[PDB]
Amino acid sequence: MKYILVTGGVISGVGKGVIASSFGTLLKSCGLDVTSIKIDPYINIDAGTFSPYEHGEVYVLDDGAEVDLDLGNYERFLDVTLHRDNNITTGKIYKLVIEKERTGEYLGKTVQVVPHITDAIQEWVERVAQTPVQGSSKPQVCIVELGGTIGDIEGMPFVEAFRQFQFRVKRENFCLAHVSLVPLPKATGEPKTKPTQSSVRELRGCGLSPDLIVCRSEKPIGLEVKEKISNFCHVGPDQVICIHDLNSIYHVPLLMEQNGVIEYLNERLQLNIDMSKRTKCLQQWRDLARRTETVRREVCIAVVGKYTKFTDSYASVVKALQHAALAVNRKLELVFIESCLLEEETLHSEPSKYHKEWQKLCDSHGILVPGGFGSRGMEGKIRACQWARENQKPLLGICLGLQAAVIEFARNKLGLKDANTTEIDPNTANALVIDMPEHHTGQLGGTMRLGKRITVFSDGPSVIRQLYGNPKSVQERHRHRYEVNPKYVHLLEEQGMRFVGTDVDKTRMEIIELSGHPYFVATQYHPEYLSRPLKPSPPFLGLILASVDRLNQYIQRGCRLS
Amino acid sequence: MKYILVTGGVISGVGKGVIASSFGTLLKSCGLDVTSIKIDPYINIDAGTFSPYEHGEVYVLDDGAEVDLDLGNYERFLDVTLHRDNNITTGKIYKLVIEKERTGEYLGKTVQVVPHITDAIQEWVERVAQTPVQGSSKPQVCIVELGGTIGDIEGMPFVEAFRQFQFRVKRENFCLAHVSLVPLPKATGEPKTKPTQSSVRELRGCGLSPDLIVCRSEKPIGLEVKEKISNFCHVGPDQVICIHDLNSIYHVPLLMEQNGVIEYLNERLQLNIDMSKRTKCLQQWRDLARRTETVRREVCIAVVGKYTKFTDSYASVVKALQHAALAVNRKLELVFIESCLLEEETLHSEPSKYHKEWQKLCDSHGILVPGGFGSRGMEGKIRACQWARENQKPLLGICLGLQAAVIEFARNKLGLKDANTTEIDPNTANALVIDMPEHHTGQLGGTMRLGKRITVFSDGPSVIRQLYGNPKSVQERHRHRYEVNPKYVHLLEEQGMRFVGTDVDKTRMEIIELSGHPYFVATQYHPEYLSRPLKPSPPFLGLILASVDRLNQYIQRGCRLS
Amino acid sequence: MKYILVTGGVISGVGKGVIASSFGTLLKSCGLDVTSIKIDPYINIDAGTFSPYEHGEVYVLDDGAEVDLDLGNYERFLDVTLHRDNNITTGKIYKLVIEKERTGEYLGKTVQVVPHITDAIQEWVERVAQTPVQGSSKPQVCIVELGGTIGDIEGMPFVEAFRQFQFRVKRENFCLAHVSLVPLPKATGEPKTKPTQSSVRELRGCGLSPDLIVCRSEKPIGLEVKEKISNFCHVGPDQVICIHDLNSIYHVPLLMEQNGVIEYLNERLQLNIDMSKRTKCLQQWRDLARRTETVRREVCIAVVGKYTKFTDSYASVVKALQHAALAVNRKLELVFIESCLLEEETLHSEPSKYHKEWQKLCDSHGILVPGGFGSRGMEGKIRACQWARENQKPLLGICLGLQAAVIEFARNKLGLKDANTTEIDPNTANALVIDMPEHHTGQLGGTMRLGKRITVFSDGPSVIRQLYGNPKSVQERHRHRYEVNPKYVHLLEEQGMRFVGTDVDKTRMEIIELSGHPYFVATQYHPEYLSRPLKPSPPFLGLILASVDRLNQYIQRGCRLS
Known part of the structure; x- marks a missing residue:
């Protein structure tokens, strides 16, 4: 009955996730429930033949296949989840449009765009209207988001479809809101916005009328x-x-x-409201906002990414881990260390940017593991993890690192030099981790090792099991394609390399642990995306607690401003 | 409070007057009164520097200055009149916009076009809203017509001005109606309309939404x-x-x-209605519609225009005279006689279109007088009037004929060959009618002989005075610039050329009459534009009555449909 | 034969004067001569009903009437001048378009826009083509500039007029160049330009094709x-x-x-070139660019403007005076002192921003005179000039200050308190300077005291006469409307207030000087706009020379890099 469009940005990776999440948590705090439906105005699926990471952060946060790029903050903030019917894109629609015109349902008549293309979108909205998630019955407000880009060639049928749902009902059910960025001059200083007057001309040229106010700034400007x-x-x-x-x-x-x-939209669409203090409950957000800006530490934490600018490998990772770190009242400092200019491309050229990098990771405490893009870095990632283990520095469990963890362990504890990188040129004889797809049920042939899989542990007392209240079968998802061979793990059992986590077949060693180390965490899943504000993550939280063991801080405050 | 826009056509002279007159007489028949405000998207007044007649029929039907071109049917159908504040055009607005920006009323602020032009049109609508004509107090419905063309570059601020009056009031006060012509190709047969789908795109490209249904055809089409x-x-x-x-x-x-x-617009705007038979009174129009198609005569009537196509010299003249001819139950057959190709340009070239035109006027009953377009006809118009007087045929009083009537009278009754055309080359010695402007009050200098003038007759028993119930001072308007000299009328008094109509100074002989002729009418005003359906015109009605004197026809019918 | 369009900016007051002046001095250095024709897309002249200064710097630099706002740098850089046929705007064209359609030259035909508006611009370009200035015969290259804004509503006929001159000649005579500003991000760092890809769509949507490269930045960005x-x-x-x-x-x-x-445009249009060192002569600009960045002084110079931001009262004043100050090798520091918040609106509110202003003007050396905007400041301008004269600080000759100079002189030397401000409320009895227009030839009635007037001095030895080589009649222009009464100057002759400059009637005292002061300059003309790089200005140059008299600096360098 209620449909409110949400306008994102003009480029996937600017900051439209915090804007769309503000309107979603408004009705959740008043006692209602909504959904989250988006659309990608591109070509096809982003997780197809495109690179795994370059412009969009693709993961597997509670999904049995591929996801989008801006769906991690919705599950963490709101109480809803995402499935396979939420990653709507232009490529998914074309899979059935060509099929319906080839089988024969409209007598094979040659169509154009109306009334077929504009009416085909109605089946994607009226089907997800009464089918929410596992937590509600039927949402009264069904909002539709618009991510990626806005205003292109395919933007013509989008305007003709939005007016169909409005002309059939009253005017108290839709609120148009476009987008208008506010530029900042470099010579004068007056905030003269240009896209504001240009966005009105585009709406009047297609049959739309703006009613809301859209803006974006960083500091309270004048009136x-x-x-x-x-x-x-x-x-x-x-x-x-x-x-x-x-x-x-x-x-x-x-x-x-x-x-x-907060009171304008209540009387505009005639909706209910559970008044208590100020329309919606605010005490839940004030306790996490004031307490956040009262902690400090400035600890040297050296991390490894991919490039030097704002990439897509930690856009939604550094935000979820910061809220869960408030229980220890410690602040982590993130730096920028590129793994590309660290191998032979720096020492053989100029050793200027090489000595300053080792002076920040040796005196640190938490060293992360990057990833791997084809053949754009494979030697620097090996020397970065073996040096922290010898200098009694703990590590964390990051994916895309199991291929390099078995290389430094066979050369230091034993001496297997033939075992090298197997994800670039598979030609060595001691290839421990190779590329083996799923040969069981569900996925057949050369697919990807991911989906709704059941992870069963093996041991008991550890550091990534005691935080879940002593479970027995936790549901975790992965995002990789290489598996460990059960015939080349003979040297891992005769040493201090136990396995505190296996699978349902007792063949794949997804969780590994090195005995003797004070804090060594290594697995395959991604616990960073599951960093809920009410449930801290296993690895990064256990390192700070086992560092100084400072728990007598809560009894020192005593609520000064009570 | 009520404002309904009226869309005319795409060219001045296609038939937009009958369409706008239908919506005007709707509320007049229900017991209400409205006005008529139009606007021309052209340059300025057409009767200024342009030719007096070529594309727009310019007259003087109840006005003290210049008129538009489509204001004659409104006064005859409805009960309202037109003044000097009704011929609103783009040239009249520019006379005050340049003056207000040069004097200094808005601090001389240099702007673009808004909000100055959109607010300037509001002063032209709210001022003519409560100021109707001499017949009502305050009209509740104030409609605004749109003549001339539609869909021009200057029509951009007109769109922003129509939505201003609508967004401030309720939605039950405006009904948008564009235009969509229906062409009929001579190849296929299916009425596939093209401007219909094209007019919707133009409304969506500016910020409008069509609500009514506009169409135009000439035969009942299929469903x-x-x-x-x-x-x-x-x-x-x-x-x-x-x-x-x-x-x-x-x-x-x-x-x-x-x-x-007839009942959809009543409940749409919430207005009153005086129900009796079918919403509005229809018995007044049925008595003039069915009775019109029951008369016939097929009498040879010759008229003179200017060209062979549909010009602007008889667009509103042949329509008003047809309704007043229903009292005699006689039908007049109109032909096409061109006065241009009749002089030496046809007799010396190919004598084909000359002798044929004279075959439809020697036995006719009503011979009219054309006009004059610079030097495109001056000899053929002289032999056309003197030929009918010698064959005892009656004539009518048409303007722009006093210059040629004095030429044939001085050569046949006397023999003044020097007296020729004075409106082309004023070099003759016997120039009777010359160009003399008004030298009295009101108009100073070289102006035009027109306006609210009082016409006082001189005699009594005649043919153009006894039909008005024996008056004494009738208000008539003229449209000419040449006057008769009071010193060259010496030969008109010593013969049988009396004057049954003078002016208020007893100097200008505006009405002339030739004694001995059975029916000779000649004046300067235009009685054809005043052809009311309840009051027949003096000249054309007196010719049919004095022809056969058939008055025993009404007693033969006796109301068959009783 | 050659026509090259010049695109300015999007707002009158951003920095389009330095961009258009670069293409003008290119052909001047190669041995050719060009002109300078611009067009204002606003309403009319800004110096008409609008304020004299607010957004555009209006002056009188060599002109007998009104000027534009960006014509002062062309006369100083190039060797051309400006007249009355150079301030072409939209209001000047409409003065004859309405006149030609009312008199009658094209038979009064009702037209729309083409081919009349596009052909009317041809008369403004082909007439100024062979009529340059007083310094050349016939310029071979006739460039047309485009100031103010670009791309709006009236920009449609401008596109159709540019392609008319191109489709009639060869393709080697025009070079299209639009405008595209380069924005700077505030979070990332990559210079992603947006108006570049948007300007191409506007040119392709009207019938144009970009060929040149337009950009604007401040630092050498990457490749x-x-x-x-x-x-x-x-x-x-x-x-x-x-x-x-x-x-x-x-x-x-x-x-x-x-x-x-520099060599691409030579072979593109097939033009001559006088090669010597590098196409055009560069040694003339290198001597003024390297020597400018080798001087320093950092002297406290307190100036008075109007507001606190970049106004239009010193945009072209601080640039011309800096080049002429290179003969003394001294650098002047300009500050921002607002004259509005200095009177009773600051001492009665908060004395915070009041004490810090007097601590920078008492220890300074050169104090300027502001102006006057109606009634937005009149008491602070009086106390700012009388304090510098008592503290043996010299002053300069700035206009719009003669009304306040006679107030402080009658109260300190004598005691005339009744003599106050006359430009606001002319009700006092001792009104020395009142508003009297020109009562001679040329200007009749209430006009403005400006134009080509002959200024004749009276004395001989002074500080503003000996720098012109002892002249006798210098041609100077003014920009004011108030004149001095010859009957109220009785107390100025019996003291030490001589007049070293009168007019051609010996009545108007345009130049005044106070005896006894070491350096007192006061007049009515504007010598700042005439600050040529080869001829320093009288007032500001004489103050530095008469300060320390340091002339033994040129003999200390001796050309080190020779």
Whole structure:
């Protein structure tokens, strides 16, 4: 009955995840439940023949196949999940449009775009309307998000389809909101916005009328430009949104309580409201926002990524791990260490940017594991993990590192030099980890080792099992394609390399652990994406607790501002 | 409070006057009163530097200055008149926009076009809203017509001005209606309309939404195309207007009583209605529509225009004179006689289009007088009037004929050959009628002899005075610039050329009459534009009555449909 | 024969004067001569009903009426001048379009826009083509500039007019160049330009094709973005312009000698070239660019403007005075002192921003005079000039200060308190300077005291006469409307207030001087706009020379890098 469109950004990787998540948690705090349906105006699936990481962070956060790139913050913030019917893209629609015109359902008539293409989208909205997730019956408000890009060639049938749902019902069910970025000059200083007056012309040229106010800034600007957008849109002057988002999420609820937008949408669509303190419950967000800005540590933590700019390997990783680190009242400092310029391409050229890198990882405490993009780095990732183990520095369990962990262990404890990289040129004789697809049920042939798999542990007392209340079968997902051979693990059992985690067939060693080390965590799944604010992650939380064991801090405050 | 826009046509002179007159007489028959405000998207007044007649029929039907071109049918059908504030055009607006920006009323702020042009049109609508004509107090419905062309570059601020009055009030006060012509190809046969789907794209490209149904045809089409426009406009299939207008006005009320549009607009805007037989009174129009198609005569009537196609010299003249001819139950057959190719350009070249035109006027009963377009005809118009007077045939009083009537009278009764055309080369010595402007009050300098002037007759018993109930001072308007000299009328008084009509100064002989002729009418005003359906015109009605004197026809019928 | 369009900016006051001046001095250094024709897409003249200064710097630099806002740098850099046929705007064209359609030259035909508007612009270009300035015969290259804004509503006929001159001649006579600003990110760092890809769509949507490369930056960016624009425009990759303009003019010729654009336009249009060192003469600009960055002083110079941001009262004043100050090898530091918050609106509110202003003007050396905007400051301008005279600090001759100079002189030397501000409320009895227009020839009625007037001095030995080689009649222009009464100057002759400069009638005292002061300059004309690089200005140059008298510096260098 209720359909509110959500406009993201113009490029996948700018910051549209925090904007769309603000409107989703509004109705969740008032006692209602909604969904999350998006659309990618591209070509096909991003997780197909494209690189695993370059522009979009593709993972497997609670899904049996492939995901999008901006669906990790919805499950962590809201109480909903994502399935296989949520990654709607242009490639998935074309799989059935060509099939329906070839089988024979409309007498084989030659169509164009109307009323067929605009009506085909109606089947994708009315089907996910009464089918939410495992946590609600039927959501009354069904919002539709718009990610990726906006305004292109395929943008014509999108406008003709939005007016169909509006002309059939009343005017109190839709609120159009486009997008208008606010540029910053370098010579003057007056916030003269340009995309604002240009976005109105595009809406009037297709049959739309803007009603809401869209803006994006970083600091509270003056009131001399708030009346400029009101006359250009013929809206209310006291309804201008002045969002000053920087790089977090607590810069949004503090604004709705000052302008006056929490009560405007209630009487606009005639919906219920559970009033208590201020429309929606705010005490849940104030306890996590004020307490966050009261901790500090400035500890040297050297991490390894891929490049030097803002990549897509930690866009949603550094945000989820920060909320779960508030139980220890410690702050971690993230640096930028590129693994490409570290091998022979730096020592043989200029040793200027080579000596300064080792002076920040030896005196650190937590060293992470990067990944691997074809043949763009394989020697520097080996020397980065063996040096931390010899200098009694603990490590964490990061995926895409099991291929290099078995190389440094066979050369230091034994002396197997033939065992090298097997994911580039499989030609060595001591290839421990090779490429073997799934030969069981479900997936047949050369597929990928992922999906809804049951992970069963083997031992008991450890560091990644006692935090779950002593379980027995935890549901975890993976994202890899290489498996360990059960015939080449003969030298791993006669040493101190136990296995505190196996599979349901007792063949694949997905979890490995080295005895004697004070804190050694290594597995295959990704516990960083499951970093809930109410449930800390196994690896990164256990390292800080087992460092200083400072638990007498909560009894020192005693609520000063009570 | 009520504002309904009226869309004319795409060219001045296609038949947009009969369409706009249908919506005007709808509320007049229900007991209400409205106005008529139009706007031309052209340059300025057509009667300024352009030719007096070529594309727009310019007259002086109840006005003290210049008129438009489509204001004659409104005064004859409805009970309202037109003044000097009704010929609104783009040239009149520019006379004050340049003046206000040069003097200094808005601090001289340099702007673009908004919000100055959109607010300037508001002063032209809210001022003529409560100021109707001499016949009502305050009209509740104030409609605004749109003549000339549609879909021009200058039409951009017109779209932003129509939505301003709608967004401030409720949705039950405006009904958008564009235009969509229906062409009929001579190759296929299916009425596939093209401007219908093209007009919807233009409304969506500016910010409008069509709600009504606009169509234009000349024959009842099938029902297979009635549902084609409904799905393209999201309207009701039972509200499609299928008008089959031919060339009159009675082809409109016969359709509203079959589809169902006389009661749709009543509940749409919440207005009053005086029900009696069928919403509005229809017995007044049925007595003039069925009775018209029951008379016949096929009498040879010769008229003179200018060209052979549909010009602008008789567009609104042949329609008003036909309704007033129903009292005698006689039909007049109109032909096409061109006065251009009749002089030495045809007799010396190919004598084919000359001797044929004279075969339809020697035995006719009503011979009219054309006009004058610079130097495109001056000899053929002289031999056309003197030939009918010698063969005892009656004539009519048409303007632009006093310059040629004094030439044939001085050569036949006397022998003044020097007296020739004075409006082309004023070099003759016997120039009777010359160019003399008004030297009295009101108009100063070289102006035009027109305006609200008082015409006082001189004699009594005649043919153009006894029909007005023996008056004494009738208000008539003229449209000329040449006057008769009071010093060169010495030979007109010593013969049988009396004057049964003078002016208020007893100097200008505007009405002349030749004694001895059975029916000779000649004046300067235009009685054809004042041909009311309840008051026949002086000249053309007195010719048929004095022809056969058949008055025993009304006693033969006796109301058959009783 | 040659017509090259020049694209300015998107707002009148961003920095389009230095960009258009670079292409003008290119052909002047090769032995050719060009002109300077611009067009304002606004309403009319800014100096008409709008404020005299707010967004555009309006002056009188060699003109007998009103000027534009970006015509002062052309006369100072190039060897051409400006007249009355150079300030072409949209208001000047409409003065004759309405007149030609009302008189009657094209038979009064009702037209629309073409082919009339596109052909009317041809008369403004072909007339100024063979009529340059007083310094050349006939310029072979006739460039047309485009100031103000670009791309709006009136920009449609401008596109149809540019292609008319191109389709009639060869393709080697025009070079299209639009505009595309390069934005700077605030989070990432990659210079991703957005208006570049958007400007190509606008040119392709009207009938144009971009061929040149337009860019604007401030620092040498990387080469990773130079190949991004080449593929979007299908041009040469080695022809991308990377201008790093900051705030001067010497940041342009140093780039043309590195990329390769000085020889590309020579063979593109087939023109002559006087080769000597590098196409055009460069030794003239290198002597003024290297020597400028080798002087320093950092002297406290307190100036008074109007606001706190970049206004239009010193945009072209601080640039011309800096080049003429290189003869003394001294650098002047300009500050920002607002005259609005200095009167009773600051001492009665908060004295925080009041005490810090007096601590920078008492220890300074050169105090300027601001102006006057109605009633937005009149008391602070009086106390700012009387304090510098008592503290033996010299002043300069700035206009819009003669009304306040006579107030402080009558209260300190005598005691006339009734003499106050006359430009606001003319009700006092001792009104010395009132508003009296020109009552002589040329200007009649209430006009403005400006134009080509002859200024004749009276005395001989002074500080603003000996620098012109002892003249006798210098041609200077003014820009004011208030005149001095010859009957109220009785107390100025009996003291030490001589007049070293009068007019041609010996009535108007345009130049005043106070005896006894070491350096007191006061007049009415504007010598700052005439600050040529080869001829220093009278007032600001004489203050530095008469300060320390340091002339033995040229004999200390001796050309080290010879």
